[model samples]
Target chain A: GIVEQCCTSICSLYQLENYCN
Target chain B: FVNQHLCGSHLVEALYLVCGERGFFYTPKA
Candidate 1:
């Protein structure tokens, strides 16, 4: 199943990209 | 990714600024 766009965006933007760190 | 790309969710997000963008507003501004 494809991941939700919201989840993917959050993960990539927030986690991987270190959003609010 | 120009005018035809406007009036959509992606566009709205893009116009909000890399920081204030809707999708990932709270993230970095880059």
Candidate 2:
């Protein structure tokens, strides 16, 4: 549960334009 | 579940490293 939540945030962070673009 | 564990572990480490960059990174454009 904790790991999934952490992964979700991390994924969202990396999906940011600054990180992806 | 093995794959999930590995995926999560890798991402956890990745997040740590990215955050370690400067305790934060740029946010996405809205």
Candidate 3:
């Protein structure tokens, strides 16, 4: 639940780019 | 089910490590 909601933001903060891009 | 390919292993691995330090862990693929 939390990860689903935060993954996108976390992915962005971490600069995953693949999701944030 | 979420898989390594869905979010990229880098993210999964990163989360895995971070979770480990904080007493949490990533969700295994379903």
Candidate 4:
């Protein structure tokens, strides 16, 4: 849950890098 | 192992904080 939400935030920054995390 | 290169700033900082590391999650400050 935390990871997913964090990814959303990561992606919101326009960084596709979130997929790795 | 996950690629750090593939991880964004928020995620990078997260793992470092949650384990070391939201809702629909908060929008990134970026």
Q: Model-by-model lDDT, in order?
A: 0.31, 0.39, 0.41, 0.38
lDDT, residue B17, model 1: 45
Q: Note the residue pairs that clash in candidate 1.
A: none
Clashing pairs in 2: none
Better of 1 and 2 by TM-score: 2
Among all candidates shown, the one with the greatest TM-score: 2
Instruction: Tell me what fraction of the real C-alpha contacts between chains A and B each candidate also makes.
Output: 0.02, 0.04, 0.00, 0.04
Candidate 1: list runs displaced more than 4 Å: A1-21, B1-7, B18-30
Give the per-residue Cα lDDT of candidate 3 at A18: 25
What is the alpha-carbon lDDT of model 2 when measured against the actual structure? Answer: 0.39
lDDT of 4 by residue, B1-30 (tens): 232332356465644443321212323453
How far residue B13's Cα lies from its native spot in candidate 1, in Å, is: 0.1
Over A1-21, each residue of candidate 3 has an lDDT whose tens digit, in order, gives: 334534543333333222221
Per-residue lDDT over B1-30 for candidate 3, one digit per residue giving the tens place of the 0 to 100 score = 223323446556655554454544445342
TM-score of each: 0.22, 0.31, 0.30, 0.27
Distance from true position, residue B19, model 4, in Å?
1.0
Give lDDT tens digits, candidate 1, residues B1-30: 222323335533533443443233332223
Report the Cα lDDT for residue A18, model 4. Answer: 38
Error of 2 at A10 (Å): 12
What lDDT is obtained when candidate 1 is compared to the true structure? 0.31
Please state the Cα-based DockQ of model 2 relative to the true two-chain complex.
Answer: 0.12
Model 1 residue B20 CA deviation in Å: 4.9
DockQ of each: 0.06, 0.12, 0.07, 0.08
Candidate with more favorable, higher DockQ: 3 or 4: 4
